[PDB]
Design a protein around this ligand. Structure first.
Ligand SMILES: CCCCCCCCCCCCCCCCCC(=O)OC[C@H](COP(=O)([O-])OCC(O)COP(=O)([O-])OC[C@@H](COC(=O)CCCCCCCCCCCCCCCCC)OC(=O)CCCCCCCCCCCCCCCCC)OC(=O)CCCCCCCCCCCCCCCCC
Ligand SMILES: [Zn+2]
Lengths: 462, 92
């Protein structure tokens, strides 16, 4: 009867249900088009999402997929390098691209009136690019330089080394750039072979968001993407083998690069379509992140996150400069773990504290911790869907992974019914007493043994 | 003579060959590991340390008893006709 028991208990806000639909169509040649109209915008983002990457390179030509990225902006039959650059500038538009292990993306940002001219440019550079042998030799100097700057961003180097040792027996372990000797001996014939084997109509999605009309985007695509080859099958219906996960360590000791070490640990995860994928997203948020030079308004020593609290109070001074948990999904496997930076003499304490927090998911996590993590996850995910680019990336990425876009209300309904007993079930099945892979760099004299890390995945209490 | 000689010692050629043999990707005992894994003993009795210790104390209690009983039978068979219970004493 107390007013303290008549509070407004609205689980999922009504705004989650009153969202504009994402419209989809499949064309005769196999290209898929997907659009969501956001009336409160004057600009728009349109792009092409392709289901190919470094994992679809050959061992002898690892690196052609990234090489092709650069050459796609060097000239066509109807436009030259200079002409392409000037046309974009004269409209005030933007044109970007990136390549990963399983997905490749090209997108543009411009006004509504300039959308057709963007679709024309995207189809041309993707289907009619001239791979001049003379330009292939010039780029070799711009790419060998990028391999030196990438070696200066340490976090990117550590995650590559983590893929190299974990997936030794699969193309999923290849690097995106490729070895040096492959870059030096690259020819235009290696690049054309990658195109003819990977860029087909069944592996491409066109997505848009903003002040966009669906029927008009479906007619422009039907006209400009007609010269796209269809898949050829030689009566071969053989399935792909799931990558094998190797428990191993790969460490670069170096006492001449300062007092800070860098480390990353990984577990075998789950693929996109797994019935347990949502729970892995949540488990990533329970471990969370921390930066010593950017705590915010909550001091780390009194944080609600148990992992942060234990790390900040270690030896009364704190044992980490920063750490963060990650979860990455692929088509047939995944990768779950954490990255960290720390002082030479603090490395052992730091790594073992974060391991202790992951293993707590199987034994002792509380519903207060789960609901704190849920609230943070919702604020970040739902907050990043503001611009037209982030929305378009969400459409395209989901069309390749799931075959559809999940509405916001469905995600929130699936996230709502996950409690502490369901977290314990999933962690007991996948993370408890499991194999781990490790990569590291720097002053590593105090690094734990691989077997120490392997046995920290279970407790002897209980 | 190369064996034991600091002026000549080296491995013979048949030892260098044994070091070059390769059995990569072979496992003749694999059918044994498959059977063990199909009993689910790990999932039900060894993955949790509380249950692991129940398994230790319980199996040890029963095994120790069967071990003693078996050894007593062997002892009686080897020593048939020499033990007290095997030769009843006859009074005059
Ligand atoms: C008349 C004769 C009668 C004699 C009877 C005497 C009793 C005999 C006992 C026989 C026991 C055999 C089994 C041994 C297993 C030990 C426990 C274990 O698994 O350790 C894992 C432990 C942690 O494993 P991990 O891989 O690092 O981490 C895995 C998980 O992530 C970690 O997950 P977590 O974080 O959940 O786990 C943390 C970890 C906690 O880890 C730690 O922080 C360290 C734990 C301490 C080391 C382990 C205990 C054994 C140390 C031996 C001390 C003997 C002193 C001898 C003095 C004799 C004086 C006469 O948790 C524990 O293990 C807590 C302890 C469990 C409760 C107590 C039961 C075990 C005690 C065993 C006997 C010791 C007391 C006997 C005292 C005798 C006094 C007369 O391993 C180590 O710490 C590494 C070194 C371990 C050395 C073990 C040596 C065993 C020798 C036992 C015999 C005792 C001698 C008695 C002499 C009597 C003379 C009169
Ligand atoms: Zn590049």
């Amino acid at each position: 009867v107390s007013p303290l028991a008549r509070s407004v208990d609205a689980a999922i806000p009504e705004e989650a249900f009153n969202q504009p639909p994402t419209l989809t169509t499949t064309l005769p040649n196999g290209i898929r088009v997907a659009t969501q109209r956001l009336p409160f915008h004057q600009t728009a983002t349109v792009g092409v999402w392709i289901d190919s990457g470094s994992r679809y390179d050959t061992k002898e030509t690892n690196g052609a997929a990234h090489f092709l990225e650069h050459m796609t902006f060097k000239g066509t039959k109807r436009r030259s390098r200079i002409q392409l650059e000037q046309e974009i500038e004269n409209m005030g538009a933007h044109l970007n691209a990136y390549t990963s292990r399983e997905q490749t993306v090209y997108y543009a940002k411009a006004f509504k009136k300039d959308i057709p001219q963007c679709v024309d440019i995207l189809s041309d550079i993707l289907l009619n690019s001239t791979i001049d042998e003379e330009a292939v030799q010039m780029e070799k100097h711009v790419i060998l330089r990028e391999m030196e700057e990438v070696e200066r961003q340490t976090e990117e180097v550590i995650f590559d080394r983590l893929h190299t040792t974990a997936f030794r027996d699969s193309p999923l372990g290849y690097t995106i750039l490729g070895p040096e000797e492959n870059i030096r001996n690259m020819t235009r014939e290696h690049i054309l072979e990658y195109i003819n084997r990977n860029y087909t109509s069944d592996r491409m999605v066109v997505a848009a968001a903003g002040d966009v009309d669906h029927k008009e985007l479906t007619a422009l695509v039907e006209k400009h993407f007609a010269g796209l080859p269809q898949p050829k099958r030689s009566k071969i219906i053989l399935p792909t083998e799931k990558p094998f996960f190797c428990g191993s360590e790969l460490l670069h000791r170096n006492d001449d690069m300062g007092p800070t070490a860098h480390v990353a640990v990984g577990f075998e995860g789950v693929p996109w379509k797994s019935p347990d994928a949502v729970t892995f997203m949540l488990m990533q948020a329970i471990v969370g992140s921390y930066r010593k030079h950017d705590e915010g308004i909550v001091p780390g020593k009194v944080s609600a996150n148990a992992t942060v609290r234990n790390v900040c109070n270690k030896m009364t001074v704190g044992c980490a400069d920063m750490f963060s948990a990650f979860n990455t999904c692929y088509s047939d496997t995944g990768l779950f773990g954490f990255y960290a930076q720390c002082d030479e003499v603090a490395l052992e304490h730091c790594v073992m504290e974060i391991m202790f927090g992951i293993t707590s998911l199987s034994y002792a996590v509380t519903d207060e911790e789960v609901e704190r993590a849920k609230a943070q996850l919702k604020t970040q995910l739902l907050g990043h869907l503001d611009s037209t680019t982030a929305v378009a990336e969400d459409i395209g990425r989901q069309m390749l992974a799931y075959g559809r876009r999940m509405p916001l209300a469905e995600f929130l309904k699936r996230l709502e019914v996950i409690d502490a007993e369901e977290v314990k079930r999933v962690a007991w099945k996948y993370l408890h007493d499991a194999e781990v892979a490790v990569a590291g760099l720097g002053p590593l004299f105090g690094m734990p043994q691989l077997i120490n890390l392997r046995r920290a995945t279970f407790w002897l209490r209980y | 003579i190369r064996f034991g000689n600091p002026w000549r010692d080296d491995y013979p050629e048949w030892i260098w060959k044994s070091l070059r043999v390769s059995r990569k990707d072979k496992d003749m005992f694999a059918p044994f590991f498959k059977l063990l894994n199909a009993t689910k003993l790990y999932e039900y009795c060894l993955k949790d340390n509380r249950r692991y210790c129940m398994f230790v104390m319980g199996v040890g209690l029963v095994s120790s008893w069967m071990w003693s009983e078996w050894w007593n039978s062997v002892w009686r068979r080897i020593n048939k006709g020499k033990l007290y219970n095997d030769v009843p004493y006859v009074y005059p």
